[PDB]
Scaffold this motif. Sequence first.
Motif, PDB file in Angstrom:
ATOM      1  N   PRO H  36      34.834  -9.148  75.074  1.00  0.00           N
ATOM      2  CA  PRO H  36      34.347  -8.930  74.765  1.00  0.00           C
ATOM      3  C   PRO H  36      33.413  -8.041  73.687  1.00  0.00           C
ATOM      4  N   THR H  37      32.375  -8.086  72.805  1.00  0.00           N
ATOM      5  CA  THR H  37      32.022  -7.566  71.608  1.00  0.00           C
ATOM      6  C   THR H  37      31.186  -6.670  71.544  1.00  0.00           C
ATOM      7  N   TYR H  38      31.588  -5.891  70.539  1.00  0.00           N
ATOM      8  CA  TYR H  38      30.993  -3.852  69.834  1.00  0.00           C
ATOM      9  C   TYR H  38      30.810  -4.299  69.102  1.00  0.00           C
ATOM     10  N   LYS H  39      29.625  -3.079  68.798  1.00  0.00           N
ATOM     11  CA  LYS H  39      29.356  -2.162  67.335  1.00  0.00           C
ATOM     12  C   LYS H  39      28.949  -1.046  67.698  1.00  0.00           C
ATOM     13  N   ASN H  40      29.100  -0.230  66.943  1.00  0.00           N
ATOM     14  CA  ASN H  40      29.844   1.417  66.935  1.00  0.00           C
ATOM     15  C   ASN H  40      28.651   2.091  66.121  1.00  0.00           C
ATOM     16  N   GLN H  86      35.556   1.572  79.782  1.00  0.00           N
ATOM     17  CA  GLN H  86      36.901   2.281  78.560  1.00  0.00           C
ATOM     18  C   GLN H  86      37.920   0.940  79.081  1.00  0.00           C
ATOM     19  N   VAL H  87      37.900  -0.319  77.276  1.00  0.00           N
ATOM     20  CA  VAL H  87      38.554  -1.391  77.030  1.00  0.00           C
ATOM     21  C   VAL H  87      39.877  -1.289  76.402  1.00  0.00           C
ATOM     22  N   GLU H  88      41.183  -1.338  76.488  1.00  0.00           N
ATOM     23  CA  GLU H  88      42.262  -1.435  75.996  1.00  0.00           C
ATOM     24  C   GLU H  88      42.598  -2.850  75.328  1.00  0.00           C
ATOM     25  N   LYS H  89      42.928  -3.441  74.312  1.00  0.00           N
ATOM     26  CA  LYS H  89      43.380  -4.595  74.294  1.00  0.00           C
ATOM     27  C   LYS H  89      44.776  -4.329  73.707  1.00  0.00           C
ATOM     28  N   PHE H  90      45.585  -5.759  73.124  1.00  0.00           N
ATOM     29  CA  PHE H  90      46.743  -5.661  73.077  1.00  0.00           C
ATOM     30  C   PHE H  90      47.575  -5.042  72.121  1.00  0.00           C
ATOM     31  N   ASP H  91      46.291  -4.670  70.859  1.00  0.00           N
ATOM     32  CA  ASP H  91      47.214  -4.338  70.142  1.00  0.00           C
ATOM     33  C   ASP H  91      47.544  -2.335  69.364  1.00  0.00           C
ATOM     34  N   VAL H  94      41.479   1.059  71.628  1.00  0.00           N
ATOM     35  CA  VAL H  94      40.814   1.250  72.955  1.00  0.00           C
ATOM     36  C   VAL H  94      39.637   1.540  72.534  1.00  0.00           C
ATOM     37  N   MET H  95      38.342   1.111  73.340  1.00  0.00           N
ATOM     38  CA  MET H  95      37.232   1.759  72.546  1.00  0.00           C
ATOM     39  C   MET H  95      36.941   2.527  74.383  1.00  0.00           C
ATOM     40  N   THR H  96      35.822   3.432  73.952  1.00  0.00           N
ATOM     41  CA  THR H  96      35.446   3.691  75.692  1.00  0.00           C
ATOM     42  C   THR H  96      34.531   4.232  75.321  1.00  0.00           C
ATOM     43  N   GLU H 124      36.496   4.976  69.418  1.00  0.00           N
ATOM     44  CA  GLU H 124      37.940   3.621  69.031  1.00  0.00           C
ATOM     45  C   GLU H 124      38.755   4.515  68.917  1.00  0.00           C
ATOM     46  N   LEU H 125      39.732   3.830  69.176  1.00  0.00           N
ATOM     47  CA  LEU H 125      42.116   4.688  69.423  1.00  0.00           C
ATOM     48  C   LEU H 125      42.257   4.395  68.154  1.00  0.00           C
ATOM     49  N   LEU H 126      42.427   3.636  67.583  1.00  0.00           N
ATOM     50  CA  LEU H 126      42.685   2.932  66.021  1.00  0.00           C
ATOM     51  C   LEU H 126      44.393   3.584  66.443  1.00  0.00           C
TER      52      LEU H 126
END
Lengths: 53, 109, 217, 131, 131, 131, 131, 131, 56
Positions: H36-40, H86-91, H94-96, H124-126
Amino acid sequence: DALSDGFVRLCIDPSLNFFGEGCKILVEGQMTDDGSATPDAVTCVTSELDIIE
Amino acid sequence: ATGVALAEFLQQFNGLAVFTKNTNIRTGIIGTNPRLMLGKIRKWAQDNVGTLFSEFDNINEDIQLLTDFEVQPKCVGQPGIFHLNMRYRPPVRGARINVNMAPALFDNC
Amino acid sequence: TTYPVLPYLTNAAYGALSACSTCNNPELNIQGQTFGLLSCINMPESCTPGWTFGEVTQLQANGFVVSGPSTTSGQGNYTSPYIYNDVTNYLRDEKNRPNATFRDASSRRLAAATGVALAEFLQQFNGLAVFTKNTNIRTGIIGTNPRLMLGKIRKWAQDNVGTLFSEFDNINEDIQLLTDFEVQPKCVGQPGIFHLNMRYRPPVRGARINVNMAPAL
Amino acid sequence: CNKQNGVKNILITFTDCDTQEVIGPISHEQPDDTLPTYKNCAWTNTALTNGYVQRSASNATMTLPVVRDLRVPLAFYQGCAQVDVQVEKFDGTVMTLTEGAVVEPEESDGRSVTMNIVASEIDELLPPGSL
Amino acid sequence: CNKQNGVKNILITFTDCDTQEVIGPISHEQPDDTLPTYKNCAWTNTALTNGYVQRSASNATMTLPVVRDLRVPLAFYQGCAQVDVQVEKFDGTVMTLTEGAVVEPEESDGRSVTMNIVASEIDELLPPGSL
Amino acid sequence: CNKQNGVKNILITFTDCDTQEVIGPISHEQPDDTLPTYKNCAWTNTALTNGYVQRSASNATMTLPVVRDLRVPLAFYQGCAQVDVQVEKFDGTVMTLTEGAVVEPEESDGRSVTMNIVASEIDELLPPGSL
Amino acid sequence: CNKQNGVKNILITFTDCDTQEVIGPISHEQPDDTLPTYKNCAWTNTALTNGYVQRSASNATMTLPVVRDLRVPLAFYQGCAQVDVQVEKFDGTVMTLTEGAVVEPEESDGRSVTMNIVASEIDELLPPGSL
Amino acid sequence: CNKQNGVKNILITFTDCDTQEVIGPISHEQPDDTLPTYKNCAWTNTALTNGYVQRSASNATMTLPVVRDLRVPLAFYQGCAQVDVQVEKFDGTVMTLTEGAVVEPEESDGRSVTMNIVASEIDELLPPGSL
Amino acid sequence: SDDTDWQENLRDWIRSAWDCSKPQCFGHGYVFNKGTLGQVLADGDNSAELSRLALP
C-alpha cells in the motif's frame, strides 16, 4: 370537531419541557420553620411560586 | 385555531409511506422520511408567521419531529407513530417605548 | 344499542366499499374522512354519540371496527357515517400470543397478494433440471443448484422492497432454501422437493402524530 | 458518513391546473452528477459608488436537473402544472419549496429535464447545530 | 517558505440584516485551486485621445470562491446578509474588507459559492518591508 | 428490456402544398446519437417579482434530426411541404404531431436534415400505467 | 475446501426485446484464466479538496469473459438481448444480476466474448457466517 | 530485525452510510507482493515560473490492495461504506486513516480489491526516535 | 347566574373540553362577579377558561 378520525391527536399544554432537565444546580441555605420541606434532604424546585410555603 | 390548523395540515401524512432507518426513498416510491416531514412542517410554521404565530425565537430548536422508535424504551415502539413538539408564541402587539425628553439651550451645530 | 340505521345496511356499505376501493390497490386502509366514508348511509345528526370515548377506545383495543358521524350538529339534517381503524378481529395468534401482525385488514390483503406474487415468480423452477449433489452444472445444460435458486429468490425479494416488503434487516437469514434430502430424515427425501422459509414485513404507513404544542412565557 | 457532497433525496409534488389533482410526492433521480442550484435572498444588490449599494427586488430561485418519471406527463415538468419540491443532501440540509412555477421550459429528449423554479421563498433546514 | 502563491486563511463575518446578530469570524476553505481576485483603485481610467485619460468612479471589488459552511444559511452567501471578509495569502499579504455587499448572486448547488463583494475600499497589508 | 433511452421509430407523412398529394408514412432513421427533443406546454412562464409569474403564449415545439430519404425531394424537409410526424421511443412513449410546419430551414449537405417543427399541440402516449 | 479462488458456475439467460423470447438459463465456460470482475456499489465517490468527496449516482457493473455457446446467435452476446447473469465461485459466493444490458460490444473471433454488463444493482450471497 | 520493508497488519472498519451499522475492525491479507502507498501532505504544489510555486489544497490519498473477506459484501469495498483503515508495517510505522471514502472503484474478480481511499488527513506513528 | 358553584361546574366542563385525552371541542365561558372589591378578588381563582366580569 373535524379531528374525529383519530389520525392526529392534539395535546395543547403550555407546561411541557422538550430539552431534558439540563444543567443541574444545587442551592444550599438556611430556611425558617414556616416551610414545608424536610430539612437535610435535596429536593427539586420547578418555579418561584411554591418556594414561599 | 392553531390546533385545528395544524391538525388539518398534518392530514397529508395519513396513509403515506414512511421510510425510517434507511431514509433513501427509492426511485418511484411516494414515501417520505422524518427529516423531509420536519422540513415541510417547519415551512408551514414559518409560513403562518403573522396569522397564527409570532416571528419566532429559534425555529431550529422550537420544532422537533421524533419517531416513536426513539422515544419509548427499546423494543417498545410501534411503526408509524411520530411525536411532534412545537413551542410557539402568539403574535405580539404594541411596544414599551421609553421617552427620555430633554431640551438643549446651548448650540454647537 | 341506540343505532338508528338498520345494521345490515351500514355493514353491507362498509363491505362494499372495502371490496370496491382496495381490489386494484391492496395496500390502502379503508379509514379516515376521505377514504373510509360511507357516502349513502345517512343518519340523523345528534351529539349524544352512542359509544362514549372510553368504550370507543376499549373497542379499538379489542379488535373491533368503530363507526361515528362524519359531522355533528345539534338539530341539523342527515349526516353520513364514517369508520375508524379498519382492522380485523385478530388480538393474538395460536398458542395465545399478543402479536399484532394481522391487526389491520390491509396486512391481510397484502399477505395474500405477496403469496400469489411469490407463487407466480417461482413457477420457473418447474422442470428446471436441478442439481443437488456435485453442484457443478456441466457446459451447455440448463440446470441449476440450491445456492443459485436461493440467490435468485433473494434477488426477487430484494428488488420488491417498497412495494411488497420493508427494509429487510437480516436477509442473510430471513430467507432460507433447503433441499428435501436434508429437511427430511435419512432415506426419506424425494428428489425435486424444496423447502422455502421466508419472513416478510409489510410496509409501514402514517399513523398518530401526537402533537404537543405549548406556548412559552 | 458526513463529508459527502451530493443529493440524496428528491421529492416532487405535482398539481394539475385544470383539475386541481395532487400527485406525489414522488421520488426522483438525477440524470448526471450535476447538483441542483439555489438562491434564497430576495433582493439583489448592485454596486453604485465608492461603497454603496442599490437594492433591487427578485425571487427565490432553484435549478433542478431531474430524470422524468414515466408515469407523469412531460408537460408537468414544463410549466403546465404547479410543483412543490423538496431536496435533501447527504450532509443533512433540506431545501423545501412550495407553490413552484417552472419559469423557462426547454426542449427535452423525453428523459432528462431541467426545471427552473421560482418561488417567494425557499426554506433551509441546516443540519443540527447552527448559528 | 514565503515562496508559494496561494491562499492560507479566509475569515468571513456575517451580520444578519433584520436582527443585527454578528456571526463569526468563521474560517473558510476553497473549493478548487482558483484564488480570490481583487481590485482596489476606486477611479477607473479610460483612453481618450493622443495621450490623455478620462477618469470614472467605481468600487473596490473582490471575487471570493468559497465553500459554504453547513452551519450558516445559504442565503447569507447570496446577498441577504452583510459580510466582512479577510483573506491571508501564503507570502504574508492580508486583504481586509468590511461592510461588504454581495452584489450579484447566482445559483449554487449548495456547497460552492462565488461571492462578488463590493466595498468602499480594500486594505492591503504587504509583508514586512515595502516602498 | 424497457430500460433503454433511445428512439425506435420515426414516421413522417409529407403533404405536397400545390397538389395535396399525401406521401407516407415513410419510416426514417437517425444520422447520429442525438435524439429528437420536445416541448408541449403552450403557455410559457416568465419570472416577475417576489413569487409571481407572467404567462406568454407559444407553440408546441419539436426538433427532429433525421436522415433524408432519397425518394423525397430535399425541399420537403425545408418548409415546402406540410408534415405529420410520429416518434416512438424504446420505453413505450409515442409522440404524434399533425399539421406541422418546418419553421426554420438551414443548409444541409443532402443527407442529414434537422427539422424544427411547430404545431398547435403534441400528443404523448405514456407507457401503460400513468398518473 | 476453501482457498480455491476461481469460478465454478456461470448461468446466462437471454431475453430478446424485439421478439420477447427467453433462452436459458444455460451454463457457460471461461475461455482463459481471467476471472469476472464486479462493482457493486451504485455510487462513485470523487476526490474533492480537504477530505471531502462528491457522491454521484452510477451503475453496478460486471466484466464477464465467457465462451460463446454454439446454440445462441453471436448477436445475443453483443447487446441485442437482455442478459440475466449468475456467477458462483468456489468459496460459495454467488453474484446474481438481472435486467442486464451489454454496454459496449467489441469484436469477437466467434468463440470468446467479453460482456461488459451494467445493472441497477448486483446481489451477493456471502457463504454462511457474515458481518 | 527491523530491516524489513513489508506490511504486517491491516485493519479495516466498515460503517455503511445507509443503515449505519459498523463492522470490524477486521484483519486483512495482501493478495500479492505489492504494498500500500500513501500521500500525507494535504496540499499539492504546482510548477510555476522562476522558482515560485502555487500551493493549493487537496486530499490525503491511500492505495490499498487487500483480499476481500468472505464475511463482508463486495459492495463495502467499492465505495458503499465508510472505511476506517489502519496499516502497520514491520519497521513499526503505523498509518491510520478515518472517515475514508473509496473515491474511484474498479471491477474486481471477487477476491482481490484495490481501494483508492481519500481522507482529510492520515496520521503516522514513526517508531521510537524522531526528528 | 351568580352562584360561584354553578360557575365552577361550568369551568370544569370547559376545562374537560380542553383536555388531552379525548378529541377537543375548544370553548370559552363568560360569567360575572358582583360585589365590593374584596368580595370580587375573593371570587376569583386561576380559572383560565372563564372571563370574570367584575361589577361594582
